[PDB]
Amino acid sequence: SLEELKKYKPKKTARPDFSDFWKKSLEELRQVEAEPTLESYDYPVKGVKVYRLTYQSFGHSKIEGFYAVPDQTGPHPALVRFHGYNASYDGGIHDIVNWALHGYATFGMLVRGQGGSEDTSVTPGGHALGWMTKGILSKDTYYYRGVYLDAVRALEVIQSFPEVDEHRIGVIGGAQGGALAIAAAALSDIPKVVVADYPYLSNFERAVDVALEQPYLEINSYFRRNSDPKVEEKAFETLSYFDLINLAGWVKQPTLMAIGLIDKITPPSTVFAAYNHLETDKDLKVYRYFGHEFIPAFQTEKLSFLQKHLL
Amino acid sequence: FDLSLEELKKYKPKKTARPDFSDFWKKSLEELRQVEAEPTLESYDYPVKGVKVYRLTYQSFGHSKIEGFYAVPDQTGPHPALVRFHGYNASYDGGIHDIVNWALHGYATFGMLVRGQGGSEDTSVTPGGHALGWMTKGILSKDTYYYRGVYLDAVRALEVIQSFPEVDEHRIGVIGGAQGGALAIAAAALSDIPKVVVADYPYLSNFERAVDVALEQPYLEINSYFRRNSDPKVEEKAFETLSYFDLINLAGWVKQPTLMAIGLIDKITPPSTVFAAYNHLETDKDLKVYRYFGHEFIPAFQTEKLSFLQKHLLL
Amino acid sequence: FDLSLEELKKYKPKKTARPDFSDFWKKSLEELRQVEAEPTLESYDYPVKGVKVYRLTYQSFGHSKIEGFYAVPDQTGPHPALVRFHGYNASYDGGIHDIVNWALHGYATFGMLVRGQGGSEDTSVTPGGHALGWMTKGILSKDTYYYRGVYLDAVRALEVIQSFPEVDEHRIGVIGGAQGGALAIAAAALSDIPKVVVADYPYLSNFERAVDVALEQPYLEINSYFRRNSDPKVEEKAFETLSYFDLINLAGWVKQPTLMAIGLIDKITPPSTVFAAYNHLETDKDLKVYRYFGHEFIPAFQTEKLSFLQKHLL
Amino acid sequence: LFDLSLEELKKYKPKKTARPDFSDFWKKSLEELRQVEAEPTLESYDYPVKGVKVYRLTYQSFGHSKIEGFYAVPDQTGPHPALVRFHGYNASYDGGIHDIVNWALHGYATFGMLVRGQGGSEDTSVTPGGHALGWMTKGILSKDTYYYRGVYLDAVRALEVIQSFPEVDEHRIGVIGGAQGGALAIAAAALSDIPKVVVADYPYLSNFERAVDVALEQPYLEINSYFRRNSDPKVEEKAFETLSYFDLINLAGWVKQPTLMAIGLIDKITPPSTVFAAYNHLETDKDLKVYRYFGHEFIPAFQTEKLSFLQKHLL
Amino acid sequence: LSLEELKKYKPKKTARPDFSDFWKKSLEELRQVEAEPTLESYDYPVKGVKVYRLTYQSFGHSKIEGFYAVPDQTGPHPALVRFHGYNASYDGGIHDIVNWALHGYATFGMLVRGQGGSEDTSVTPGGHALGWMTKGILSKDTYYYRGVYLDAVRALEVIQSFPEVDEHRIGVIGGAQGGALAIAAAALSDIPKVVVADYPYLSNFERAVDVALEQPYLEINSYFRRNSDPKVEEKAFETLSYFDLINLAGWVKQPTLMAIGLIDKITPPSTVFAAYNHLETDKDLKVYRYFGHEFIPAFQTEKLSFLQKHLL
Amino acid sequence: FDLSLEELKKYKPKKTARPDFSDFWKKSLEELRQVEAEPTLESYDYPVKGVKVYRLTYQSFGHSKIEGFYAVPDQTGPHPALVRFHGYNASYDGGIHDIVNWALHGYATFGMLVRGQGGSEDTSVTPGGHALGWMTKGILSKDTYYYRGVYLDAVRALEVIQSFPEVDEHRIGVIGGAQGGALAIAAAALSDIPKVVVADYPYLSNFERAVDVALEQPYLEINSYFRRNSDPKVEEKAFETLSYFDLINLAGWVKQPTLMAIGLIDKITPPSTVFAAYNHLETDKDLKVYRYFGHEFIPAFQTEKLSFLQKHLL
Numbered sequence A: 001s002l003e004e005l006k007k008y009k010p011k012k013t014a015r016p017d018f019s020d021f022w023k024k025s026l027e028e029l030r031q032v033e034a035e036p037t038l039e040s041y042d043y044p045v046k047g048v049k050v051y052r053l054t055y056q057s058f059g060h061s062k063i064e065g066f067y068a069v070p071d072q073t074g075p076h077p078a079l080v081r082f083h084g085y086n087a088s089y090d091g092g093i094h095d096i097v098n099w100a101l102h103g104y105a106t107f108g109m110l111v112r113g114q115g116g117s118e119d120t121s122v123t124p125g126g127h128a129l130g131w132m133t134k135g136i137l138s139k140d141t142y143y144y145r146g147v148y149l150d151a152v153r154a155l156e157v158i159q160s161f162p163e164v165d166e167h168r169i170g171v172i173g174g175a176q177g178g179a180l181a182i183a184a185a186a187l188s189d190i191p192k193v194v195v196a197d198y199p200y201l202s203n204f205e206r207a208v209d210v211a212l213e214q215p216y217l218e219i220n221s222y223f224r225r226n227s228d229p230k231v232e233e234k235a236f237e238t239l240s241y242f243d244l245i246n247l248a249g250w251v252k253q254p255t256l257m258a259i260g261l262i263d264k265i266t267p268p269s270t271v272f273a274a275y276n277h278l279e280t281d282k283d284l285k286v287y288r289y290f291g292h293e294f295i296p297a298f299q300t301e302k303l304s305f306l307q308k309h310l311l
Numbered sequence B: 001f002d003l004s005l006e007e008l009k010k011y012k013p014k015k016t017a018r019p020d021f022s023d024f025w026k027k028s029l030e031e032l033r034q035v036e037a038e039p040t041l042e043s044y045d046y047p048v049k050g051v052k053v054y055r056l057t058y059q060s061f062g063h064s065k066i067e068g069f070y071a072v073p074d075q076t077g078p079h080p081a082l083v084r085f086h087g088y089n090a091s092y093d094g095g096i097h098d099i100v101n102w103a104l105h106g107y108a109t110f111g112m113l114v115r116g117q118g119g120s121e122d123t124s125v126t127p128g129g130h131a132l133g134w135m136t137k138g139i140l141s142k143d144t145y146y147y148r149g150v151y152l153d154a155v156r157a158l159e160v161i162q163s164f165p166e167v168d169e170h171r172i173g174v175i176g177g178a179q180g181g182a183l184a185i186a187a188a189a190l191s192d193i194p195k196v197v198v199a200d201y202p203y204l205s206n207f208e209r210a211v212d213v214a215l216e217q218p219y220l221e222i223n224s225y226f227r228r229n230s231d232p233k234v235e236e237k238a239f240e241t242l243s244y245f246d247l248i249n250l251a252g253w254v255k256q257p258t259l260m261a262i263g264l265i266d267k268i269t270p271p272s273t274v275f276a277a278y279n280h281l282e283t284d285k286d287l288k289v290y291r292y293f294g295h296e297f298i299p300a301f302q303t304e305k306l307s308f309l310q311k312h313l314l315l
Numbered sequence C, F: 001f002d003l004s005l006e007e008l009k010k011y012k013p014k015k016t017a018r019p020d021f022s023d024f025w026k027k028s029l030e031e032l033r034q035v036e037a038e039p040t041l042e043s044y045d046y047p048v049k050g051v052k053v054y055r056l057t058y059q060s061f062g063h064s065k066i067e068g069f070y071a072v073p074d075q076t077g078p079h080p081a082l083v084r085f086h087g088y089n090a091s092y093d094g095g096i097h098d099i100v101n102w103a104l105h106g107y108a109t110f111g112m113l114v115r116g117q118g119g120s121e122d123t124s125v126t127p128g129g130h131a132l133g134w135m136t137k138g139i140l141s142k143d144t145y146y147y148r149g150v151y152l153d154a155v156r157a158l159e160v161i162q163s164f165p166e167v168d169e170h171r172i173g174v175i176g177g178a179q180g181g182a183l184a185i186a187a188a189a190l191s192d193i194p195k196v197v198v199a200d201y202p203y204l205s206n207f208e209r210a211v212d213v214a215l216e217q218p219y220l221e222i223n224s225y226f227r228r229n230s231d232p233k234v235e236e237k238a239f240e241t242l243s244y245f246d247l248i249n250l251a252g253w254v255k256q257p258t259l260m261a262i263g264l265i266d267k268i269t270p271p272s273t274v275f276a277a278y279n280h281l282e283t284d285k286d287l288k289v290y291r292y293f294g295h296e297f298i299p300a301f302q303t304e305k306l307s308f309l310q311k312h313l314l
Numbered sequence D: 001l002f003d004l005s006l007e008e009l010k011k012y013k014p015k016k017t018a019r020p021d022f023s024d025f026w027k028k029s030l031e032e033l034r035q036v037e038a039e040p041t042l043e044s045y046d047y048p049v050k051g052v053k054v055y056r057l058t059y060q061s062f063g064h065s066k067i068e069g070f071y072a073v074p075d076q077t078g079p080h081p082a083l084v085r086f087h088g089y090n091a092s093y094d095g096g097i098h099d100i101v102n103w104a105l106h107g108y109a110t111f112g113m114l115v116r117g118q119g120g121s122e123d124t125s126v127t128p129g130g131h132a133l134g135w136m137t138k139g140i141l142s143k144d145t146y147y148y149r150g151v152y153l154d155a156v157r158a159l160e161v162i163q164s165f166p167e168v169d170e171h172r173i174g175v176i177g178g179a180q181g182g183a184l185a186i187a188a189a190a191l192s193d194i195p196k197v198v199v200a201d202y203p204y205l206s207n208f209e210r211a212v213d214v215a216l217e218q219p220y221l222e223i224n225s226y227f228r229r230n231s232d233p234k235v236e237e238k239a240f241e242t243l244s245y246f247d248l249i250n251l252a253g254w255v256k257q258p259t260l261m262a263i264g265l266i267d268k269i270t271p272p273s274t275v276f277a278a279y280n281h282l283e284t285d286k287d288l289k290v291y292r293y294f295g296h297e298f299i300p301a302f303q304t305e306k307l308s309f310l311q312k313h314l315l
Numbered sequence E: 001l002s003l004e005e006l007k008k009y010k011p012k013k014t015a016r017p018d019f020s021d022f023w024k025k026s027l028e029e030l031r032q033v034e035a036e037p038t039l040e041s042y043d044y045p046v047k048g049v050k051v052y053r054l055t056y057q058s059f060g061h062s063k064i065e066g067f068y069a070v071p072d073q074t075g076p077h078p079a080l081v082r083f084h085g086y087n088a089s090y091d092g093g094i095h096d097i098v099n100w101a102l103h104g105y106a107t108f109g110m111l112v113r114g115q116g117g118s119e120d121t122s123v124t125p126g127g128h129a130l131g132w133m134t135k136g137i138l139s140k141d142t143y144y145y146r147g148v149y150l151d152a153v154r155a156l157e158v159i160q161s162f163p164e165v166d167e168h169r170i171g172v173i174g175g176a177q178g179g180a181l182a183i184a185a186a187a188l189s190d191i192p193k194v195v196v197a198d199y200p201y202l203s204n205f206e207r208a209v210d211v212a213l214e215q216p217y218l219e220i221n222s223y224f225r226r227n228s229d230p231k232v233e234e235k236a237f238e239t240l241s242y243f244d245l246i247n248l249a250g251w252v253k254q255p256t257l258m259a260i261g262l263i264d265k266i267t268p269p270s271t272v273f274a275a276y277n278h279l280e281t282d283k284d285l286k287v288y289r290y291f292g293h294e295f296i297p298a299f300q301t302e303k304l305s306f307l308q309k310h311l312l
């Protein structure tokens, strides 16, 4: 119930070496030269310049994404946008450009092997169909390790741009994107604000027992194929290093979140769990009649919130 | 839902192989040969009597470590052998129970696990975005395509098995269903080690039609790919890549006796895609058609399978 | 699921228009002209920069008050303009976010809301029973049919927009998908105000085939109607009424450049019904065919849409 | 099972949501209705039945709407007892003439009123603004413009018309219906003293605030679709305010006639709790038939009850 | 197929040389059993109609049940034997029976062995798919519908023998399975004067199994999946041929009224047209474009009108 | 979708057995004894090496001829033996491949086919109407109920196997899943011939709860029955009949070591119905709980099964 959801705050599952793991990971990332590249890209828009932007990241993977900038003298405020799980079509260029038309230098980072970008990370062994369980038996090999770092590197690259006001950079996204937005804000102090639509990758131990649809269930499919009890124990150990309930505590930027009460993909409880772990200026928008989908009303909130803090 | 039986019997789509088809594989096999197998065996406890069970790994294309269980009849050989390939994302606990049962039928059996699926390592980089699944990983290039490494692993597997002392290299067979049947055929086409081939409704065949006739996963992964990459050239390049791995192009190299099965109401590996591969085989072959079965275990064909293998390898 | 492409490219069903087709509309436009627009603008706050947003209403057929958001680029014009029509029962919050984004692309945009759906008033009486939905309201007579008022509202909308000072009347376009695309085409056919037309898989086309080929709502609303009214004459009269609103009969009056899209696996607006309308257009036209898309947002066509509108209006 | 426990259902009695002007609203509505001349009309209608006369009956009602319906009377000297039958939501085919005629064959002068724009009848009421696909939310932002305002009055006027017939014993008139029909039967009995008995199969339009959170199928969910399209918080508040004027938990209190109701425990359309809520608000001779293994459908066993109950009170 | 093709679809009969002999013998075995009918008053909230429970002995000495409703007045009244759909009988469909009586017909709703009611003594030879469709399917002598068909015949014999029943005005009606029993009964007996069958089932079996999209025809497919032996399939269809309507229709000489919904997935239009096109008698088929395997209001008027004309 | 694991571990519904429970079976076993087994063996060709395969029939309750494949390790015995029972309407080609594989594991195995399902004759008359399926055949009386004959066939099967020379009567086991597991437990309860019992998510247990918790067939066959027979007494009598065959009433007679499995997301044999049976066992027992599996083949439990049988028989 809404009354219980408002109070649901599961106990962190972070291991003693939680922060050490990330400290090291950030370091390995730092050992890679960004070597960013910009390439003009033609698009039927007036008042905005569009480019294709790539840069080197963790494991020497080349990360892609479209970069749209308001066509005028800046520095303009900027946004790094993250897309949903297996939900990126044509690098979501139309969204990127529209954000630019709203006055934001925007870059839509494409998640490794999904919407685009290269993934050099080896596949240690078998796993369920999907990205959720690639290299899940070790925090070092897990899929989202590289992804999280790419999100951080993305901010480093954007911030370094001359036409970008480094003091007015925001991160936004829904589900997977919202999770990347929060993880990036937790692992970096570059973003000034965070907006996350029903964030994914949160409260994994409950998610696998409450979700009714993919992709959380990819973990269940994994356990079905690997009956060893130790596998389950090790898998959840790995996931704890990437769980939002453990990362939320490091977020110090103002955060705006949304949750649809009939969401079957990113269950309300998993989202409230992340929200209730945030120790910063925050606000959660609850929509009774919406699920894992585009919520018109929240779009107004999003625009208003970003405008207030960046525009 | 697919073609009638009269048309199916005559369906033989034009090969889509490019001029460099055989060259591509010739090079691929070479790169594979540049990797030392360095196989390893490790005893594995299992509640069976009369059979020895092991965990077997070996190095393959791109230096990937391939896994799989290896069961051998507990007695003096050399015993005939079988390399078994599992279905797409359909491997549970490395299918050990099946492996062991095959051994109990008198065969030295190895169930190779497909890269990143049932097990095994996949070192191959992911060039760029692709649809959820393995079907489109590195699909924009025959060199980077997922099944390139897999096919080679299948070949290397045979090289490893054959080299075993307790294995009669003249009585080695390859079996599998769907993805497994496709790997069985591809291995026989790329190697002369196997003496016989059994493939239950083979997958990875007649791609250009499959994407227009399949009603369920995983062929539709290709469709999802094109939805996310509207560029017309992408489609053209993707099918170019697939042609190098299509069974209608590999079948022609199979010279071993082949037994195949097809369920007429199969929605995953459409009858037409399977007949297409079959009609491209130029060797002793036989296709078992089951009117009331789909993409599933077909009891009646199991008898055929056993009988066929027994005749050519066992008795 | 539909008929081969090679056949689709040649599918051109025989018009079903009755002798009084054009007369019916001539009279309808007249009745509409007997109503004073009396438009109204009201500022509306929206978290956007560089665009002014308003709520716009005006009187139309049967004295119905029509609603819609109106967004204009915040700067000296006259700016080119677009009248956007939304899909069947597919309007949320008057689709304000789309309206505003169009304005941000440099177009004075008005998203007309279809009577009783996304908004707007519908004074038209309900003659008798009909299936759940709008598709069969007053279907037993062309005078009482639901889309009669809607079509006229679309026309009146253009009259209102065109009269605006910050709007260049020579650069006005109509766009929409499914129901919206049908309204865009119908408006261009009944008026000469719009310069260009863009229609994503248009609805309300080739009714007699649609009811035998569609796999999902809302075309099937007609089938539900016939199930509840077994009288043979009802079916005959219903299709007679529909003929006056069918795109295969209106397309012939469209003289503006038209851009259309169709997803080959569309179950709602079957490919054949869309090709039928397209093949009846006698004007500069182009149909974008997408093999792997259905009745949904097609990213690739969005580029075409922007490009086409930019070329003809910007 | 999916709703509240049977033990809890028997005690579920939600607090009325009626506003201070509840009874005033209806008092005025009945008055506006009275300002319209019925001007009924009868027209012979041919039907393959023996022993029954069938007619088409229309009459003027609220907003000057012409209401339709078939009228069947036992072919013999009366006055006969009479029934006004109301049909389910968008569930009327050919004006349900076969049911009408069968009721007449049971000895009842029967009239099946057709709900505005659904099974038949005219609806003059204007559509104030946008609303969800369906009738549930037409003019929902005001009790004066709400769809069921005209419908309820039509049901009342129907009774006035029937009662005035010479071949009808005004002291033996009943109202029956299921779901929407049962709701109209109860509403009519609450707003009129003409009917002697009421039978309602799992009544609809009851306990709206809970219904929208418990229903698993249409048409209650039309309200949810409405709120999805109109995010304004005030809209929700105003919509429920409007619904309260038509909610059975607020009208039941005015029912003084003997009432028979049925509820299927696995009903997903008219959830058991919404039905028990209406029943528990009735202050009159009543009886609720509970069927564990039935849902929103025809319940054979309750048909016997229905016939037996009507026969006892009217026959 | 298209309505144009459906109108001409007339599959070749599958009847074996001993077709008529099989039934001739079956009718004889039936005749060796004493009906010994029984009537028992049954209370029902109806006025103007008397209701009873009627049982009688049939093939294999099975006791057949059913409700019997008669107009409460001096007859003899015309009569109807109603057959219910496959596994579609609730409370012996008493409400329908009673309503028919209220329409002026002495009506008996025979309940099909083990389904809506009635006893089934026939042994189960061996394994078969879940359902009745394949019980004893490996032999025409042991097949489930053999006993059912005969019960339908015996039912007419019993009804006809009633004093309050005009034996020259007896009809048989039913939908799907019921319609199949109505036709089969008219083909195996000359007692009924008219036949009404809503989208008849048990027709054109060899095509039905390849065209049906839902149960219960698919029960045959389930059977073949569980019994891979090729001979099993051959023998099964051999058995079915003895009960197929395309082989029985030719013996129907009574006026017949049929209905078919073009979107029917249970009793595919082609299987129904196949039966219809094999009828050599006064007949008429009502085609409904927008209806499937369900109650069709418009056809109900036709049904009433047709029965009224020929019996009323 | 059931209760918590904490509650399941403690769920032990009150037995529903009637005073004449044990008397009913005592008589039933007697009637069975009045029938001469008259078993028959017939060689059957199968592409296997090291195993002999036969078709075995024998007479049982009501003089029904029961079938099944019989595979024996091709070597000098006596070998340990297994009687395998198949799932509800889940037998294809008499599951010969499984039978033969068991034999290859060293067990003389007989896969009894359940009356009218996988094979075997069912002479029992059908008293009256019932729902589509076997679950409610003759449900209005314990004497006429379908599973009465089936249970006895299971017992007679053990009598026949035990009597074989190549079979060590002190090492005979019964195994099965769902319906098969229910037959394995019932047989062990009605006979002292089997030394061990293995039952995968046993069916036919805790009927009164099952009908309110099951989400799929075949338990729901009972619900279909009550829908077609509204008489309140019917329901009462039906559950009375079922009580005589419910595992929660038979489990108490099982004295052999028992191994059971349950998938927590099982919708066919709900976890609670299986735990109810398990918690009524008063013998060496162990229940394997699988969180991510349902009514299906569970690889991990197969290892347990093999290991358990090997320990007690091989």
Ligand SMILES: O[C@@H]1[C@@H](O)[C@H](O)OC[C@H]1O
Binding pocket: A290, A293, A294, A295, A296, C090, C092
């Ligand atoms: O899913 C919904 C979509 O269908 C609609 O178009 O916009 C709002 C979304 O929530």
Ligand SMILES: O[C@@H]1[C@@H](O)[C@H](O)OC[C@H]1O
Binding pocket: E083, E084, E085, E088, E089, E090, E091, E092, E093, E096
């Ligand atoms: O119970 C009835 C059944 O016997 C009949 O066949 O179909 C209608 C049902 O209501």
Ligand SMILES: O[C@@H]1[C@@H](O)[C@H](O)OC[C@H]1O
Binding pocket: D091, D093, E294, E295, E296, E297
């Ligand atoms: O199937 C239809 C049913 O849903 C409706 O209620 O009554 C008419 C039938 O044809």
Ligand SMILES: O[C@@H]1[C@@H](O)[C@H](O)OC[C@H]1O
Binding pocket: B090, B092, F296, F297, F298, F299
């Ligand atoms: O249902 C699963 C099946 O699909 C797989 O093949 O084997 C393991 C089972 O649990």
Ligand SMILES: [Cl-]
Binding pocket: A124, A125, A126, A134, A135, A136, A137, A138, A141
């Ligand atoms: Cl891993």
Ligand SMILES: [Cl-]
Binding pocket: A262, A263, A264, A265, A291, A292, A293
């Ligand atoms: Cl959702």
Ligand SMILES: [Cl-]
Binding pocket: A286, A287, A288, A289, A290, D227, D228
């Ligand atoms: Cl909401």
Ligand SMILES: [Cl-]
Binding pocket: B127, B128, B137, B138, B139, B140, B141, B144
């Ligand atoms: Cl690629």
Ligand SMILES: [Cl-]
Binding pocket: B265, B266, B267, B268, B294, B295, B296
């Ligand atoms: Cl399939």
Ligand SMILES: [Cl-]
Binding pocket: B289, B290, B291, B292, B293, E224, E225, E228
């Ligand atoms: Cl088959």
Ligand SMILES: [Cl-]
Binding pocket: C127, C128, C129, C130, C137, C138, C139, C140, C141
């Ligand atoms: Cl109308």
Ligand SMILES: [Cl-]
Binding pocket: C265, C266, C267, C268, C294, C295, C296
């Ligand atoms: Cl679609």
Ligand SMILES: [Cl-]
Binding pocket: B226, B227, B230, C290, C291, C292, C293
């Ligand atoms: Cl496409």
Ligand SMILES: [Cl-]
Binding pocket: D127, D128, D129, D130, D131, D138, D139, D140, D141, D142, D145
């Ligand atoms: Cl309103």
Ligand SMILES: [Cl-]
Binding pocket: D266, D267, D268, D269, D295, D296, D297
């Ligand atoms: Cl329901």
Ligand SMILES: [Cl-]
Binding pocket: D290, D291, D292, D293, D294, F226, F227
């Ligand atoms: Cl019930």
